[PDB]
């Protein structure tokens, strides 16, 4: 038996990739637009957190990472890094 991937492509991979792209969009927002960039970063993190919940619905509670878990975790790291990057930029530009 071999698994089909239309479900996981449409509902998990593409949304995660697009949320990562939207996290990148914060870099192109002008600096000093602090509410906009902060809201974008943190709400992208919230959306990624919401998306990461449906990854394990099919699976049992196995205690090892899977490919989907790795992908979602890396996307979460990317959006987290974008938000922390803007935080560092704002802190070092303010002073």
């Amino acid at each position: 038996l071999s698994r089909r991937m239309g479900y996981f492509t449409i509902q998990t991979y593409i949304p995660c990739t697009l949320i990562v792209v939207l996290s990148w969009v914060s870099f192109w927002i002008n600096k000093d637009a602090v509410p906009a960039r902060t809201s974008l970063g943190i709400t992208t993190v919230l959306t990624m957190t919401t998306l990461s919940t449906i990854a394990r619905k099919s699976l049992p509670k196995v205690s090892y990472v899977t490919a989907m878990d790795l992908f979602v975790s890396v996307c979460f790291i990317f959006v987290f890094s974008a938000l922390v990057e803007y935080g560092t930029l704002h802190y070092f530009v303010s002073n």
Binding site: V21, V25, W28, I29, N30
Partner: peptide, 25 residues
């Protein structure tokens, strides 16, 4: 993404104030 592209080309950080007349170009 369209809003991001729009904002990239926005020069002034202040919006129109109503009273001031806009000289159309």
């Amino acid at each position: 993404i369209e809003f991001a592209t729009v904002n990239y080309f926005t020069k002034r950080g202040y919006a129109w104030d109503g009273k001031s007349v806009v000289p159309e170009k």
